[PDB]
Hints:
Blueprint: H1 11-21, H2 44-48, H3 55-58
Amino acid sequence: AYRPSETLCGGELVDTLQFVCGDRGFYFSRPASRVSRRSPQRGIVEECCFRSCDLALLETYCATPAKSE
């Protein structure tokens, strides 16, 4: 069997973002911005919930890229 949802939308998306970044931090919006309002720009949800994504694509929404040399 496959997952009921191979996509990520809710708290499970946030969990994955914490996992792939570790302590590096991440943004839900494509731009990082400098004003953490309750209204972010569009971003991760478009590719991982409204579409399907991969961890490599997901990591591009991280504050810094992969550190796994």
